[PDB]
Paper text:
The ten Frizzled receptors (FZDs) are essential in Wnt signaling and play important roles in embryonic development and tumorigenesis. Here we report the cryo-electron microscopy (cryo-EM) structures for FZD1, FZD3 and FZD6, including three structures in G protein-coupled and active states, and three structures in G protein-free and inactive states.
According to the results, we found that all the three FZDs exhibited constitutive activity in G protein recruitment, in which FZD1 has a constitutive Gq activity, while both FZD3 and FZD6 have constitutive Gs activities. Size-exclusion chromatography (SEC) and SDS-PAGE analysis reveal that purified FZD1 can form a monodispersed complex with mini-Gq (Gq); both FZD3 and FZD6 can form stable complex with mini-Gs (Gs). The structures of FZD1-Gq, FZD3-Gs and FZD6-Gs complexes were finally determined at a global resolution of 3.6 Å, 3.5 Å and 3.4 Å, respectively, by cryo-EM single particle analysis. FZD3 and FZD6 also contain the HD and TM domains but lack the H8. Structural comparison of FZD1-Gq, FZD3-Gs and FZD6-Gs with active and inactive SMO (PDB: 6OT025 and 4JKV26, respectively) reveals an outward movement of TM6 in these three new FZD-G protein complexes relative to inactive SMO. Such a movement of TM6 was also observed in the FZD7-Gs (PDB: 7EVW18) previously, suggesting that these three FZD-G protein complexes (FZD1-Gq, FZD3-Gs and FZD6-Gs) are all in active states. In FZD3-Gs complex, V4005.72, I4045.76 and L4146.26 form a triangular, hydrophobic core to interact with Q384G.H5.16, L388G.H5.20 and L393G.H5.25. The side chain of K4136.25 forms a hydrogen bond with the carboxyl group of E392G.H5.24; E4035.75 and E407ICL3 of FZD3 form polar interactions with Q384G.H5.16 and R385G.H5.17 of αH5.
Numbering used by the authors:
A (entry chain C): 30 to 86
B (entry chain R): 164 to 172, 176 to 265, 275 to 466, 472 to 502
C (entry chain B): 4 to 340
D (entry chain A): 1 to 56, 206 to 253, 264 to 394
E (entry chain N): 24 to 149
Amino acid sequence: TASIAQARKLVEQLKMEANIDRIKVSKAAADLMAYCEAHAKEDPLLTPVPASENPFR
Amino acid sequence: WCPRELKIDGYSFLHVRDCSPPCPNMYFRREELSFARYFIGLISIICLSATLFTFLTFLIDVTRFRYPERPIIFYAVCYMMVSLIFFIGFLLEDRVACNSTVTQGSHNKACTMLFMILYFFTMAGSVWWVILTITWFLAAVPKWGSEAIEKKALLFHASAWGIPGTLTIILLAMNKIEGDNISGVCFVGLYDVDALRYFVLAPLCLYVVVGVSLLLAGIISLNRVRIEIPLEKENQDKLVKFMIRIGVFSILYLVPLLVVIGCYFYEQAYRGIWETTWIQERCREYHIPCPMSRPDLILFLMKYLMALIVGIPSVFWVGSKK
Amino acid sequence: LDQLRQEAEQLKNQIRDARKACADATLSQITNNIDPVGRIQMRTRRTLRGHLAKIYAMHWGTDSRLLVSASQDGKLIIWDSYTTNKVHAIPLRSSWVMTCAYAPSGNYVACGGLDNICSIYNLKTREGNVRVSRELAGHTGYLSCCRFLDDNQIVTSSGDTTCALWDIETGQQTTTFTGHTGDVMSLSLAPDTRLFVSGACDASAKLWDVREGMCRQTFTGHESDINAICFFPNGNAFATGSDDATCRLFDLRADQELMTYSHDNIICGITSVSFSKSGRLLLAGYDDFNCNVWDALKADRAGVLAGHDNRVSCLGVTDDGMAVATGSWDSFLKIWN
Amino acid sequence: NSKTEDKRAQKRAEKKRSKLIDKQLQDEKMGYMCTHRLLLLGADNSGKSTIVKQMRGIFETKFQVDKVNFHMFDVGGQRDERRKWIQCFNDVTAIIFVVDSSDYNRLQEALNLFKSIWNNRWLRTISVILFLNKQDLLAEKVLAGKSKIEDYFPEFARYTTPEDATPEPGEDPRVTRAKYFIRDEFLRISTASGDGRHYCYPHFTCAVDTENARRIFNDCRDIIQRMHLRQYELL
Amino acid sequence: QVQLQESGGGLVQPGGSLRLSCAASGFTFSNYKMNWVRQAPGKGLEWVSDISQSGASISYTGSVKGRFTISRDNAKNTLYLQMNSLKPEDTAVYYCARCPAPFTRDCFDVTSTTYAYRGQGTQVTV
């Protein structure tokens, strides 16, 4: 294509390689499921609430 | 003059006051009445069930019946009121209507409320068929969609219950309610010449003529499309079936109504001959001063059959069974 | 200019090798001991009818009370979810609206579409009338999604592969975000407002920060255009719905695709994507007239919610996670709980 | 009790405002559904502006014929990509597709665009009022003989004028053969997928025609009739 | 990630036979309609050919009707186009474009280089 567009693509691709700083996939999945189990108690859709609690009875 | 056994403590009989028609064999001897009674039972099961299936249809779902084809349910309920009235007349026999002379006038509650329900619901059923014709007219000629027809629907209700409502009450001003001896119900004008001619024949005739006119207008506006489509292309095998279906519906409702109208004209034509014949052939045995046609059982039974059967076509329009 | 593509391919291969080295185990076999969600049946609690034409977008706001919906009549109707009362019915000078937004504080409402103009309206007036407070121009293409940072700044994604941040009282753009090859179709903001992602028509979801105009990272792994996007409530993951009948959940920190939600039975494309408050439930509104709910841990279709006569266009979940609003092309808004 | 009375007063005020809004929407119902909306598609040189001239980002014009209103949209402010915003025009009653008959390089891409419009999922139930613009330029081009149809369409040799075709009074058979070849080329892909539902309405128009609005009005009447013959089982 | 690789073409004398290969990586190739689109020097984008998912329905531009042929292999995830008896105006840069929808027979591939689902193409010089 144009030199400017591919130059921008190359400089962006090189700039994202300057700092990457990733995390372990298994540890990230563990963090995700830990958040899901920690905040599941007050979720109004995982566990249905009685007609007094919700305003959409 | 006036027979002594037909006296009350004033009716319209022998054109003099305080005389009543007899009960129950003034014109028909033998057990023939009961025979006709049995026959009307053979017709009750024809009506009480048939559009009841339509009720079952309205007991299945509501949103299917859009307003251009909705008033059929009001027609069905307004004639099943008549059906249950004839059924309770069958149950309550001549006991409800013959205390013994007829139960004329607004004295007992047997004839009054029975008349108030229906006469009013028969007229309401006729007006509801007229309203169905109105909806067909407005959904055929000006091509109104089935959402801009309901906005005037309340106005149609103002003509669908108020118009019978001002007629089911105006007959009570002159106290023109009489019981029926053949079946055991109460109605108007069974022994008058002006109570039934000016209050039953005129409204039904007006309703019939306006229904026929607007339905012919709708069917010719649909015939416009029926001639527009196959001239260019298409097989023309769908709307023709629909039009013959609506034509069979129209004929199957309108023919019994015209038969009822003709029978009413027969009654008004030969009521004078019938009462003169009664006067002549029941004068020597009743030692009343004597001053030639007899009524027919088959056609009165047929007229009652027509008046009870006009609720048929609402089971016609239920379509294929699901 | 072939050599530039050569080192582009070299760095692409390096990225692929690094991604292969980073991942060894997927989330599917990690989560096996977790008990499933269970069969959930959300009945249609409310039906918010009254729109003249098809609805495209809706938003909830911080309070779980007032919806706003944009329809092709050119009407933004602001509803009340509790009592089904139309609080306002703002008309538009252009009937072709495509998105709407509701500010975190109930002051401003936004709209835009094929007119390439973002219109901002005040929901307060001492004169007592709703007026066009601001018109925002500078986008050549149609506006696909607008969202509010605060009462001052608004970020809008347009049809010319550009996401622009605008200052309301200034009236001009402050920072543009370019780099997408196709039309961006969805936009989601972070709970901490620092970052936001844009999914485009090239199976690419680019993560940006609202301070400087840079793309933090790109996410790829879809097959068709991305029609919806939504962050996790945690703020470290996001699920994208596309036309390839797949909902893909990605992780920001891992710079990788996490999980796929799809079935061989489904045939249409996802139009709308949203989460619950806890984040376990992913509600995706499809084009087959229905919506599907999924668990974000085991990809099991927990339930199917129907009741629309056309394609589902917009899905929303309140900030307290109380109810789910669905808006289809049959002019019918439905509230589900 | 005073606080409850004030709360009920505010609730009834809100209900009154909601009823006023609903009344305004019901008032706008008939005005919105009375109008017919049309979308114009074509090339840059297709001349999609000469269609209505006497009654003349987004280019919108309104014209009324015989108590029927027509909005007419000419969206051209967007980019060349069409697969996304063309889903917005689903409630329109017709699509005016204007094709330059004189040009032959763009004829194939016009055919491809029309095929894509016909086979689209969200444009499946939209009828196309297909036009054939610039008849005079086509006539001069085909009588000049400098350009040949067979250079771009090899199937012109095995083609003849259909007997259903009604030629204009006074013309050589070559112009009729060419214009009806193009008409049949569009109608071949128009009548290949859509089983009823939507139909193509071919027409021949020039830059000096002064009655295109009448053609559009008649075709929209036919489309409205065929659409009303869809929800009802009559067809 | 979606990717399309184009191989073949080059300096070919007129009247020869030439085969162009397009290999698909990423998506499921057995599910997508595929188009062949050329860009001539000094002109705009123009459509050449297409092929459906199973290859049942194919079509060609009238300028290349009959001589061109198109085929695909879903097991190899690779499609082929063969030109025979070439005339010198066919010199162009060729691309295989994917039809961006799961189950359709129509889409929009003639765009001014802003399209996404299209490989880098091969330059055929004649």
